[PDB]
């Protein structure tokens, strides 16, 4: 069983890739080829983004996938098979690349922004969520202190409505 | 208002406590919203059918806990709401502020007061969809009641838990039939008798707020708001509000009847509730069913009506008699919602279009109207003595059924026609004029005994008033006994015959 | 080892459990999800693949947190069975709704079970006498058969079923049962009351009736499977007990309605009249299961509430076939005022033949139906022109037919609430003779209003004399 | 007179809300949000350390 | 509709006929058969050639007798012939 | 045949009502949603194409003769009315009160001929 089901939407392919590669070690090995592939796609503005279009022919889709894999052994591992399978199954998997990254984080990294009344963009890369959270929050407050602005606490709206409606 | 300042301080203190104990880190973010339905991701552990508190302020129910995207309809306007706003899990199934204190207060969908009277106390906030009592916790209709307007009511009673239904065209005033029915909660409820108490709770499902004001004023002026909690759902109000409103009325009915006192309910125009369920289903994702309306229309209608019953002494012998009101187009008895409901409700009172302009302010189709309990749970005045009068009501209705173009075969048919037609011109209990359990049988008894039938048909419109006033100020002992003794005995029948002779005389 | 599944999604009353293991729950088996308010058992309905099976709820669907551990019984819902069932009004899960505690059942057969074997079907022509005039002559009730009373919404279905129950049960000679689907709550309460009062179920003594109630309040899946539970109890009481068992189903159209509500949320494309895509097949599987094989006798009363009061509705149309002795009651006859409301020109029993109830009875019914059909056929010209404008033969037939139609109603023992008269049970042979006479003019001069709500022609003549005394 | 009193009471809450708008505008205009940021940090730290 | 467009014809046994006592209930006017007497033993045909026309005439007088009034000789004879047949 | 032989080439169609039933069956059989008649989307295009195939040219004419089976007084059907008002002349052969004592089985009353001028 994967760390948590990603609720589909072309995330089925990524979920299956995570499960199969988790049968093997294929964890950093899987994510590394994916990161290289995504970087390569970004490295070609066109022919790698316009290549992520439905209009690409089946021969064209297989050829584009093969050419992307042609960047030496940057397409090493089961990611090659997944890319070829998608080449006819579903053309667009950049979101599937991000989902593979999400699965990798779920396997190893975890963590997401808390929120509540803060709009901060931090991270807490630790399995536990009962110790490091406070340290991460205080650090991100005392270091950087970027645009975490929710404008104001919604309780202002709460009190305003509460008083304004008897 | 310094009290408003204190209320603000208390509410903001509660909000500060809530913020300090937010316990909301992985709670859902609304992915998209529309048509009062908001598709929201996250909320990974939200219990099904639990209210969700949304950042834009308007909350809503969570209906379809779909794989991943948990669908929460918005119980308020969308102009405030937007995608990506945080969705806060209330953690509780939708529950309504319920209790005896709501008396005289008009409450919104979940029970938010809307008149402007401030808070109303609570004797429990139960979920909007309670499981109705089964067989053993249920009982028969052993205690009768009064519908107030004669309104073919002694003909077809409305007893303990009698799930009666109605129908009519647009602006048919079936709402007014309901209002008059409610006003009868002043000749028994306004006393002090719990056994006579039938604490009505009307509903307002999808009506023009001006009509709501008219209802409120008519409740106050005739002094009804002392006994009627009218849950409101504006037409301008959002679809989820209207859909949940009948469930709120169900909750109020549980809060009353479950306590052990005999209570009553009258759902508003429920056709609007059905249209709201249509909006909720056909707008969120659910495929439509029969008559293009949502498939579970019967399910929702039953879960509303089936809540009403008359429990046994095991549960306190209390009851929540209900008078659900459905609407058609063109007075259509034959419709999906109308016919399906008429299967669910145990009584029907059909209001036509012709008669609604033809001959009666009530215009209740006596022949068409029926209730599944005529004997058991009828006005003991109208049956224990006037049971022959009930059979005569059925017989004269059948008689007037054949009175269209047939010839004059004899004099018996013609006499039955004239007497029953005078009776029908009589029986319409004028609007907002509930006065019944005193001379109900009198009309049919005098017709067969030839007291009113000898009067002119048109003149009866005042002759009845004179006869009633004569019974009041002249037959005061006998009339008061008929009110109170619970039966019109043969001796009381003779004294009423004497009073009838007096009425015929003067 | 234990089988546990996680509720992946709960949409309407059709919930999903993604049992993420090897041996997924079998189709049509019971999955139990432990809601704090009880055992919300589920019917594993469609193995939607990817280790996900969609279930129909057997109880409430509110508050089921996505991911609740669902434990699998594995086999069908094991409805308790046995004589102990008698006097206890079980619930759709077989849970004893009677507040008498658990019922000590020696065994529990599966609710879903194989229908009667094609070669074990004891054809019978025995007519069960119920006493009601339309039941008396127009359509005989097959003894140990399946009599379906497909009729409009409460326009007589509930009352007719109740009266037939109060009639047959006393001399049932076996162990009857009552099964309801979508029963009006007050009507269910009244049925329980009448069964208790009639002595049919003795609270502390012997009971010939065991009830399963599926009132309309329940969730759709419960409404659909409650009648199946009743049928399982009935078949168990028919084979294992091997004695005549009268099982009556009220508003079996509600079962099809449950199918319709469930199906759309279950992902089946909309069918005819929006009905469930599998109306006939499921209705057969829950109807053909009920039969009187050589193992035992089964008296089946399966009332169908024809939606929209027009028997053209696809669900009632599929219902009409599987039932043997059809006693249709429609609002047209009711509006005339006749309480028994049977459409005599329509309600027919294939159990009725020349050699079934008598050549004279067959001829009497044929003449009566011909006369009534003549009245209906001439009704158009009658209304358009008048009774005088047609033949005196036609006028005589019309008058006799009107008298006959007014003779169709009768006072039923429990309907005394409405008509007020103590109930009258017309003897089959007496009724046939009375009708033959009335067509033959042995009482054609009796009063029309003295022909409604009386017993046989003897009570008709007594009523005519009473009308001679009073009406004058 | 009673109706006039009820309407004036509503006018009171309306005017209070209208001045509350200016009061809220003051909160952003004055950099008490600086004085509010530390309070937010402390409250969140306490909340996370709660469990 | 599809069957009646594909089948050979019909014996459209309307319910009124079976209710009118005529069991079996072939509503002769509403009946049809594309094949017809050409697929029949002519022994039947010699009498059916008149039977069909007699039923047709009875169909022509059904309304006239439905009025329940007098007429000419042909009409009354047709009504008696049709009812008898 | 009209294009090549250039003689007045007749044209008879067996059951244009069956043709329309087939067209609707094709549309439903196809994924398309049949709604340009209320039960048929393609009825317009296909029926018009088939009818306008019967055309008259300067070289010559190819006279058609289509049989519009009456679905037992189907006055409601939009496609039947389109077919009936898609032609010019017709003959009505009823089995009732028209085949009665008639081998032609026709009804000279209900028939029509737009080409009929003195």
Closest CA to C11 of C307, C233, C277, C262: C262
C-alpha dihedral (B289, B294, B299, B301), degrees to nearest 10: -130
CA pair distance C145, C113, nearest whole angstrom = 20
Asked if B7 lies within 8 A of A115 by C-beta distance, the reply is: no
Active-site pick, B372, B397, B419, B483 = B372
Instruction: List, comma-separated, the residues after which chain D is broken, a break being a C to N distance over 2.5 A; otherwise answer none.
Output: none
C378 interfaces chain E, CB cutoff of 8 Å: yes
A130 to chain D, closest Cα gap in Å: 7
Asked if B374 lies within 8 A of C417 by C-beta distance, the reply is: yes
Q: Between B387-401 and B412-427, two packed helices, what is the crossing angle to 10 degrees? A: 110
CA pair distance C382, C395, nearest whole angstrom = 9
What technique solved it? cryo-EM
Helix (H, G, I), strand (E, B) or coil at F12: strand
Has C39 been annotated as catalytic?
Answer: no
Q: Residue with structure tokens 């808070």? A: B119
Neighbours of B357 (CB within 10 A): 9
Question: What Cα–Cα distance (Å) separates residue B407 from each residue in A126, A150, B415, C28?
Answer: 97, 85, 13, 65
CA pair distance B108, B204, nearest whole angstrom = 9
End-to-end CA distance of chain A: 52
Asked if B116 lies within 8 A of D13 by C-beta distance, the reply is: no
Q: Which residues contact A29 (CB under 8 A, 6 or more apart)?
A: A21, A76, A77
Write out the H or E segment, with its range, that includes residue C54.
strand C53-57
- In contact, C249 and C179? CB cutoff 8 Å: yes
CA pair distance A108, B180, nearest whole angstrom = 70
Closest CA to A149 of A126, A128, A121: A121
| Token pair recorded at residue C49 | 């693949």
Sign of CA dihedral E41, E46, E47, E52: positive
Nearest-Cα residue of chain A relative to residue D13: A164
Write out the H or E segment, with its range, that includes residue C209.
strand C209-212
Q: Which residues contact C219 (CB under 8 A, 6 or more apart)?
A: B299, C13, C57, C58, C59, C60, C61
Q: Which residues contact C217 (CB under 8 A, 6 or more apart)?
A: B131, B132, B302, B303, B306, B307, C185
Q: Identify the residue among C33, C40, C49, C66 best suited for mutation to test binding to B, counting B beta carbons within 10 A and taking the highest.
A: C66
Three-state SS sequence of F64-93: CEECCCCCCCCCCCHHHHHHHCCCCEECCC
CA pair distance B65, B45, nearest whole angstrom = 10
| Token pair recorded at residue C145 | 């058969």
| Token pair recorded at residue D22 | 């200016």
E strands present in B320-451:
320-322, 347-350, 370-371
Pairing relationship of beta strands E9-10 and C348-349 according to DSSP bridges: unpaired
The per-residue b/e assignment along C227-261, b for 16 or more CB within 10 angstroms, e otherwise, is bbbbbbbbbbbbbbbeebbbbbbbbbbbbbbbbbb
CA pair distance D13, C38, nearest whole angstrom = 49
- In contact, B55 and B96? CB cutoff 8 Å: no
Active-site pick, C39, C108, C184, C395 = C184
- In contact, C274 and B295? CB cutoff 8 Å: yes
The per-residue b/e assignment along C407-424, b for 16 or more CB within 10 angstroms, e otherwise, is bbbbbbbbbebbbbbebb
| Token pair recorded at residue C435 | 């009708």
Helix (H, G, I), strand (E, B) or coil at C32: strand
Asked if D20 lies within 8 A of A164 by C-beta distance, the reply is: yes
Rg (CA), chain A: 21
- Contacting chains of E (3 CB pairs or more, <8 Å) are C, F
Peptide bond into C415 cis (omega under 30): no
- In contact, C200 and C207? CB cutoff 8 Å: yes
Neighbours of B218 (CB within 10 A): 18
Write out the H or E segment, with its range, that includes residue C326.
strand C325-326
CA pair distance C95, C233, nearest whole angstrom = 13
Phi-psi region of A110 (alpha: psi -120 to 50; beta: other; left: phi over 0): left
- In contact, C81 and C239? CB cutoff 8 Å: no
Helix (H, G, I), strand (E, B) or coil at B37: strand
CA pair distance C353, B236, nearest whole angstrom = 64
Nearest-Cα residue of chain E relative to residue C363: E21
Rg (CA), chain E: 15
Asked if B344 lies within 8 A of C60 by C-beta distance, the reply is: no
The per-residue b/e assignment along C306-326, b for 16 or more CB within 10 angstroms, e otherwise, is bbbbebebbbbbbbeebbbbb
């Amino acid at each position: 069983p994967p760390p948590v089901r990603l609720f589909g939407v072309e995330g089925t392919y990524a979920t299956a890739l995570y499960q199969a590669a988790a049968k093997n070690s294929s964890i950093d090995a899987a994510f590394q080829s994916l990161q290289k592939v995504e970087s390569t796609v970004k490295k070609n503005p066109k022919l790698g983004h316009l290549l992520l279009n439905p209009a690409l022919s089946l021969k064209d889709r297989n050829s584009v996938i093969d050419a992307i894999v042609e960047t030496h052994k940057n397409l090493d591992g089961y990611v090659v098979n997944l890319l070829k399978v998608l080449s006819e199954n579903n053309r667009l998997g950049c979101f599937e690349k991000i989902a593979s990254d999400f699965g990798v984080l779920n396997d190893a990294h975890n963590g997401l922004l808390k929120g509540t009344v803060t709009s901060a963009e931090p991270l807490d890369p630790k399995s536990f969520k009962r110790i490091e959270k406070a340290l991460s929050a205080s650090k991100l407050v005392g270091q950087g202190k970027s645009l975490k602005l929710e404008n104001v606490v919604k309780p202002e709206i709460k009190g305003g409505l509460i008083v304004e409606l008897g | 208002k310094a009290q408003p300042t204190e209320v603000s301080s208390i509410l903001e203190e509660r909000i500060k406590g809530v913020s300090d104990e937010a316990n909301l880190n992985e709670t859902g973010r609304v992915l998209a919203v529309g048509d009062g339905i908001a598709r929201v991701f996250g909320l990974n552990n939200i219990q099904a059918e639990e209210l969700v508190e949304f950042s834009s302020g308007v909350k809503g129910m969570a209906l379809n806990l779909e794989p991943g995207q948990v669908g929460i309809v918005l119980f308020g306007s969308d102009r405030l709401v937007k995608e990506g706003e945080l969705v806060k899990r209330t953690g509780n199934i939708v529950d309504v502020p319920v209790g005896p204190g709501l008396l005289g207060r008009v409450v919104d969908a979940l029970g938010n007061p809307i008149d402007g009277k401030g808070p109303i106390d609570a004797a429990g906030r139960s979920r909007a969809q309670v499981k109705a009592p089964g067989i053993l916790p249920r009982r028969s209709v052993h205690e009768p009641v009064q519908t107030g307007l004669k309104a073919v009511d002694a003909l077809v009673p409305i007893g303990r838990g009698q799930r009666e239904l109605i129908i009519g065209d647009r602006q048919t005033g079936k709402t007014a039939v309901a209002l008059d029915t409610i006003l009868n909660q002043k000749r028994w409820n306004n006393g002090s008798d719990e056994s006579k108490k039938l604490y009505c709770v009307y509903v307002a499902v999808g009506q023009k707020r001006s009509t709501v004001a008219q209802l409120v004023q008519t409740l106050e002026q005739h002094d009804a708001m002392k006994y009627s909690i009218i849950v409101a759902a504006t037409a301008s109000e959002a679809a989820p509000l209207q859909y949940l409103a009948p469930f709120t009325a169900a909750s109020i009915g549980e809060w009353f009847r479950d306590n052990g006192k005999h209570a009553l309910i009258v759902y508003d125009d429920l056709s609007k509730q059905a249209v709201a369920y249509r909006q909720l289903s056909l707008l969120l994702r659910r495929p439509p069913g029969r008559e293009a309306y949502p498939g579970d229309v019967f399910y929702l209608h039953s879960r509303l009506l089936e809540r009403a019953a008359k429990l046994s002494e095991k549960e306190g012998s209390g009851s929540l008699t209900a008078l659900p009101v459905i609407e058609t187009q063109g007075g259509d008895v034959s419709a999906y919602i109308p016919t399906n409901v008429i299967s669910i409700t145990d009584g029907q009172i059909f209001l036509e279009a012709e008669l609604f302009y033809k001959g009666i302010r009530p215009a209740i189709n006596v022949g068409l109207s029926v209730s599944r309990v005529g004997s058991a749970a009828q006005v003991k005045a109208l049956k224990q003595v006037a049971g022959s009068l009930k059979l005569f009501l059925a017989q004269y209705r059948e008689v007037a059924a054949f009175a269209q173009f047939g010839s004059d075969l004899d004099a018996s048919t013609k006499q039955t026609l004239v007497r029953g037609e005078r009776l029908t011109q009589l029986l319409k209990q004028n609007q907002y004029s509930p006065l019944a359990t005193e001379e109900q049988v009198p009309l049919i008894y005098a017709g067969v005994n030839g007291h009113l039938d000898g009067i002119e048909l048109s003149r009866i419109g005042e002759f009845e008033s004179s006869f009633l006033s004569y019974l009041k100020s002249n037959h005061n002992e006998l009339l008061t006994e008929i009110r109170e003794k619970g039966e019109l005995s043969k001796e009381l029948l003779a004294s009423l015959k004497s009073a009838t002779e007096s009425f015929v005389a003067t | 080892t234990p089988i546990t599944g996680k509720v992946t999604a709960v949409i309407g009353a059709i919930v999903d459990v993604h049992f993420e293991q090897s041996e997924l729950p079998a189709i049509l088996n019971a999955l139990e999800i432990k809601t704090p308010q009880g055992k919300l058992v589920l019917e594993v309905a469609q193995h939607l693949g990817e280790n996900t099976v969609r279930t129909i709820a057997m109880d409430g669907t509110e508050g089921l947190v996505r991911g609740e551990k669902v434990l699998d019984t594995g086999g069908p819902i094991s409805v308790p069975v046995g004589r102990e069932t008698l006097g206890r009004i079980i619930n759709v899960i077989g849970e004893p709704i009677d507040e008498r505690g658990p019922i000590k059942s020696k065994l529990r057969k599966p609710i879903h079970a194989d229908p009667p074997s094609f070669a074990e079907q004891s054809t019978s022509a025995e007519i069960l006498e119920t006493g009601i005039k339309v039941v008396d002559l127009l359509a005989p009730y097959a003894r140990g058969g399946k009599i379906g009373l497909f009729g409009g919404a409460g326009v007589g279905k509930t009352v007719f079923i109740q009266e037939l129950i109060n009639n047959i049960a006393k001399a049932h000679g076996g162990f009857s049962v009552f099964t309801g689907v979508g029963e009006r709550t007050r009507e269910g309460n009244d049925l329980y009351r009448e069964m208790k009062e009639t002595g049919v179920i003795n609270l502390e003594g012997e009971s010939k009736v065991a009830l399963v109630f599926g009132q309309m309040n329940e969730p759709p899946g419960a409404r659909a499977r409650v009648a199946l539970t009743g049928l399982t109890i009935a078949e168990y009481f028919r084979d294992e007990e091997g004695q005549d068992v009268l099982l009556f189903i009220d508003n079996i159209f509600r079962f099809t309605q449950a199918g319709s509500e469930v199906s759309a949320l279950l992902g089946r494309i909309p069918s005819a009249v929006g009905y469930q895509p599998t109306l006939a097949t499921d209705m057969g599987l829950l109807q053909e299961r009920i039969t009187t094989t050589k193992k035992g006798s089964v008296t089946s009363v399966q009332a169908v509430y024809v939606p929209a009061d027009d028997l053209t509705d696809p669900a009632p149309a599929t219902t009409f076939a599987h039932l043997d002795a059809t006693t249709v009651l429609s609002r047209g006859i009711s509006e005339l005022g006749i309480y028994p409301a049977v459409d005599p020109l329509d309600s027919k029993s294939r159990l009725l033949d020349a050699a079934v109830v008598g050549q004279e009875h067959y001829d009497v019914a044929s003449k009566v139906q011909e006369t009534l059909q003549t009245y209906k056929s001439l009704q158009d010209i009658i209304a358009i022109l008048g009774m005088d404008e047609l033949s005196e033969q036609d006028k005589l037939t019309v008058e006799r037919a009107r008298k006959i139609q007014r003779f169709l109603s009768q006072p039923f023992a429990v309907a005394e609430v409405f008509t007020g008269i103590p109930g009258k049970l017309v003897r089959l042979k007496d009724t046939v003779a009375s009708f033959k006479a009335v067509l033959e003019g042995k009482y054609d001069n009796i009063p029309e209003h003295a022909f409604y709500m009386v017993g046989g022609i003897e009570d008709v003549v007594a009523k005519a004399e009473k009308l001679a005394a009073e009406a004058n | 007179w009673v109706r006039y009193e009820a309407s004036l009471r509503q006018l009171e809450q309306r005017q209070l809300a209208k001045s509350v708008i200016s009061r809220v505008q003051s909160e952003l205009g004055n950099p008490k949000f600086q004085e509010k940021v530390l309070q937010q940090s402390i409250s969140e730290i306490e909340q996370l350390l709660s469990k």
